[model samples]
Target chain A: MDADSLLLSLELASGSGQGLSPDRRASLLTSLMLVKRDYRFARVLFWGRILGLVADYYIAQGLSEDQLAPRKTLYSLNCTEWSLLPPATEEMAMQISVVSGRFMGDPSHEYEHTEVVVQIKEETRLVSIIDQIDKAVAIIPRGALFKTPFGVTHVNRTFEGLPLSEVRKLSSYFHFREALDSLEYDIPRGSWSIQMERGNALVVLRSLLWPGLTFYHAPRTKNYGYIYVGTGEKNMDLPFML
Target chain B: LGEYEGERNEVGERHGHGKARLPNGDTYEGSYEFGKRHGQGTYKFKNGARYTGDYVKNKKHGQGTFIYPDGSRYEGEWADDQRHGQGVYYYVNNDTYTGEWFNHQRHGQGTYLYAETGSKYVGTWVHGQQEGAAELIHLNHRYQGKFMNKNPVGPGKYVFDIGCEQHGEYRLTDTERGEEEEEEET
Candidate 1:
């Protein structure tokens, strides 16, 4: 059956999947899945995934695969159509900036993999955003500070060649006094490159600023660091695994 | 204390008309008995507070909105000058609490949201204490379980994400839950 006519038939025959007969439900699902596979449905499939849901007929792109498709289907059948959509309210959003050779924190456990996800919200101030990223990285236990870089990063760049430890204290003191009304952090002595190419942020925030802000935090230990995100209009997903 | 009724009074007494302003900044002129606000009238506080709802014996005994001096507001059931029964209290701090109340405190099922941090809690309460099943959402974190006297007690699950679950016991201090839920977080 043609797509339009078939849709109308389906709508009229079983009444739009709601209050459908058991056989009709099965048929509707089967047919929807059948149509979902078509390249023409790539858009819909992509949207479903974008929404973190599996589309019966089509889902959006760039979303995690449906790990609970069966359950989702069951819930969808009995629940209202709006159930498929995520809650309308905005969730928090966070950005991370990854400096090469920096550490966030040690693994929580031998097998515990740390994938830091920051919530991006509309009301978050730039300083708060930076503070959150730094705090998230500081979660690494203090004892495991050995995994961090050779030395601390200078905040003011005055002691470019000075010992990192000496510069660390001075820079920390200065960072506190700097005017953070604007999110500009000055590195005193040394310079480190920020990987801006890879970062992921929520879509709601992206609409506001093209390149949001640069997220940062000092590495605590070797292989130990929280995800530092940079906020800018530029899209930056984390270099580390998502 | 005066009685009024529908711009007049059951006694055919005319205290005032339209919006009546009292000497102390509190005014009531809806449906009145004698010369007081006994029926449908609004009492506005001098401190930018007002109540517009049912009144019995000159007491707020039904639905109304009580705005505080600090811009915080409450909209729900009222009884004997206290927030009783189901009502919602909204705070100026971007926080809100919606649920049952006793003596102006949360005492039953309610939800609170911390607009300052996007943190939210949904559960039961006892005299403004967060008791019983409660869920907290902060950032990407979620804590769901039971609470007692406004503390996260007993077993609970903290979910950061898939495979990132922390099942443990949390000790929440009274100070942490002392603040009653507001009704403006949404």
Candidate 2:
């Protein structure tokens, strides 16, 4: 089936308070995994729980405008959230190594509780989902977040302030896998490929954020917003696009 | 002077081709200016260190090679008594680093091959530490991820040599932290 239909069917399943049955969830996960080329479904399976069938909201919202639009048509949802994964331990640090060598961190350093924004778009063409993820991974900036006796703080000046560069850098910390796994579904045979790509990316993202950082996915955009999790400056400047 | 035989400029200074057999049993041969090694030359130190390459104002400058008594060697670009620019460093233990450099330190993209572990790290660098993206291929596994101060910080994948692949967020183990601490202390 095409992506639109698969998503529409999944949304229908979500409307019920009980959600999909174990057998149905297993079957759907298996089918999606067999077609690893498309990450949208796997992403939904991963992040769908937290985002709560976000596609359904988009569908209903879009149908209000066009009754004739194809069902399950994808739309990019712009997301911004300050809450992120908690501080990483030194063990978490080693798993985040770069090709250069082992990544180093200072215990005393803290990451600034930075704001991040992402635009999640629906996939249209048949492309290597991993490649898109790799491209997305490339834009993530390297930085540091530290938690100390006083409190958590952002240590990377690159993240402290900017128009887009800061957002581009801070947004690198968003974890897409958490979104995928949020549904708490079982892994299928083909899901291994998707897991490795996203899992490896999570390690890399953590390395960049070491001491810590939050993460999100959005092709770089100029229309962005900022929020504070706990401490630091807010709304320091207007978003700039070049 | 016991046997100073070579070309001399007007006014009695070694300004051209020359060779000097010094009292310390060392020898200097090649272009000279103002009685010092000033151009392309070879200096055979009494302690067994030998230098052959470009020289500027009595110091190794430009492209050159330095060989130590123990057989370690450095061959590449040079600037003011330091290994600068692109070059290859051959350690006595067979470890090597081939890539860009600045002021006697590995300061850019390079490949480091560990002689004992038989592992290699190919990636960017900052001031001699692995501070960016890198791919570390060890005997048992390969880790591709971002590095900071030489430690892995976030999520990454471990492809085992046995063909098993695992992916997740890598957390530093207590032993790993201890090892890091020991390295820092030493």
Candidate 3:
């Protein structure tokens, strides 16, 4: 069956006429996400089908960073309220290594490097029914860009490779996966891109990741609409023109 | 003067509601409850200009329209003795301000529509001027710049707008009672 049909069936099987259970729906989304990972269009569809499932995973868990030493990392940092998780895994070992490394005057790249940025969609309080993912595992948003030292560009939900050096330059920009999460823009609606690393831009696009499925910006009237990435069932009238 | 009927009601409770003519060229008469312009009223300036709409505590408060003798008008919110509320201010010179206000000036967030140039400023403002963070839209050009008390005092990006953008370090102060500097990340 098509992705939408599969989603519809899954939604219907959730017991209530409303839709599918969280776990079942998530499983299906996960499968699609995996399938779409390598395909551009498929990725877009994955976002649409799992839009509801995609939660604002404020906490950066399930990922490890090398730059962060001694102190606990953002493995599970939640933005709903400000907080930092206590070190649980290599608690003692990390503490000792971090402390002693300073004495040796050694640069702690492994203990302090952080990668990946965790982002949350303000529109999606938790997770809507469109993008399927854990409210715990946040995806990227549009206009959200990540660049590297070598001039690689990551704009509009997709990462564009730049020079290796540019990527390296930005490697140390921040250790948090969701580093550029909610950095708002004050540009015209017609344009959606930013410069980072080299002179390249972190282009913004109209996609599910960037206010596509779950946001309504009152100010940026130019980019203030929505698009249907999923071929799923149509319900309420969409607020903006996609 | 014609509606002076009634037994001359001593409307002292009328704050922004009462009309007062200033020999200096300003006159106000509008809604006043207790001590402020709580409802609606009108104010006239010696320049033959007038404002009509919401009022608060003797000042231009709530929503109202301010018209200059020259035919310039601002129809939006207000606060204190200045434009401290939300509303749109249209100028006879072909300029328009539609956004926020504070302490009788353009503070907080706002948008300015300029004269003949058709230029625009869509961003934060302070003290009857454009300050702090702002985006200037001039024709098809754009600039991500800064301002301070109506002056461009810092480094700003002229993405599209060519000559009018100023780039530097000064910023327009926030007119809100207690708003702090937001953390900006590149």
Candidate 4:
């Protein structure tokens, strides 16, 4: 519900290779705090980063009451300067299909559509891919987040952690969206599994389609997190390799 | 050696409303008097250069627009064939200058937005260059000072959007107008 939660969230994601630079950690700590009240967001999460040719983008999520609802996404080239991103619509995704390659880092900078890129669509492409990741890769443990009878999805605060045996199977975790598939992949060896950390069972999943996304959840605890640190380009070559 | 189809006076001079395709491949459509354009009209030149607005004796006088083939545009007041008074110019590369124009040159208070950085130079411009007191404004912050030869001279301040600011005393490292080193961040 605050900035401190995101720091520890990022710290856990930094376990593998999606680690933030030491400076980014320190800088984001104070800045996200300043931005929280400035924007008056109920809760802000450090979304992730999008690698750019000239400048990388730091994404931050500002959520409303319903965490599973459509939330506000903001981005900045430099860590401190943030801009509210516009929502992606159906028409926007249509135009964005013409663009490929990594982001130019400059939002005003155009690519070819006859044409131009990222122009206004860069903003849309940002929200589009975020929604893509959310639909295709954002996985959470089944019980920690659930939908009410009224069809409202939210964090289940009263619920305890899932049993240790439940953590072992791929069926234990649920994606933010309905579902994609069985979550098994042939793109890499040991595609996804549970890691034994001393005495805890940690469910970690790597994205087979996109290069940067990594999701991990602790079964015995009410803690889980994910971070996407990549060039924002889909790994299309994966399907071919498989 | 082109076509002229419109009203003519008793003296056989082209007068009142007229539409003419000049020999130079330029077409004019509007009012005319004594074989000359003397009021509101539109002229389309061969190279796709177009001007539409008030005209006097074949010259662009009063308010008008000069849109080039590359899709660039300049619109506002004019004196004869030169730009004067308030005007706005849009570049094909996405640069835009909106302000007072003098003798076809950018002068007085104006704002020029550069496409590269999406920053605006808001202040005084003389001889088409930023000069006098001004500010280079960005989304997150701005730098304010006296700009000399399109560069900030003397001391300036960077007011960040993050709630703080630091003094920046700019020093010219070379004779180049775009070359200036800033002091470390405070």
Best by DockQ: 2
User: How well is each residue in B1-186 modelled by candidate 4, as lDDT tens digits?
Assistant: 999887777476688878889998999898986667789988899998999989875677898988989989998888868888888899887788888888878888888888876998888887777786788888767778788764577576665554444454565741322212222335
TM-score of chain A of 2: 0.16
- Please give, for residues B23-119, the per-residue lDDT of candidate 1 as tens digits: 6657655665556656666777767777777776668888878878888889899898789988878899968887788887888878888888788
Worst 10 residues of 3 chain B by lDDT: B176-185
Candidate 2 chain A has its poorest 10 consecutive residues by lDDT at A233-242
TM-score of chain B of each: 0.73, 0.73, 0.61, 0.83
Estimate every model's Cα lDDT from 0 to 1.
Answer: 0.40, 0.41, 0.40, 0.68
Going through the candidates in order, their DockQ values are 0.01, 0.03, 0.01, 0.01
Error of 1 at B56 (Å): 2.7
TM-score of each: 0.38, 0.39, 0.32, 0.49
Best by TM-score: 4
Q: After superposition, how far is residue B67 of candidate 4 from its true place, in Å?
A: 77
Q: Give the top-scoring candidate (lDDT).
A: 4
* TM-score value, chain A, candidate 1: 0.15
Tens digits of lDDT, candidate 1, A1-242: 11222222222121111223454444545544444443233212111101111212222121122211111111122212312322221122323222111111221112222455433322222223323322222121222222124332212212222233422232332111123211212211111223312121100111111122221222321221121122222222121111
The Cα error of candidate 4 at residue A231, in Å, is 1.7
Model 2 error, position B144 (Å): 2.7
- Model 2 lDDT per residue over A1-242, tens place: 11223432332221212233454445444443433334322222211211212121111111111111121222112221111122223332332221112111211122222234322111211011212222222122223223234532323233332233433233333221223112212111111111111321221111111111112222222111110011111111111100
What lDDT does candidate 2 reach at residue B2?
45
Error of 2 at B111 (Å): 1.0
What tens digits encode model 4's per-residue C-alpha lDDT throughout A1-242? 13464543444443446556776877777767777778876667777777777777888777656556667788887777778887755676555555556787887565556633324556777788777666666666667666677755656676577776677766666665553222322223223434554356556666655667766666666667767777666544331233
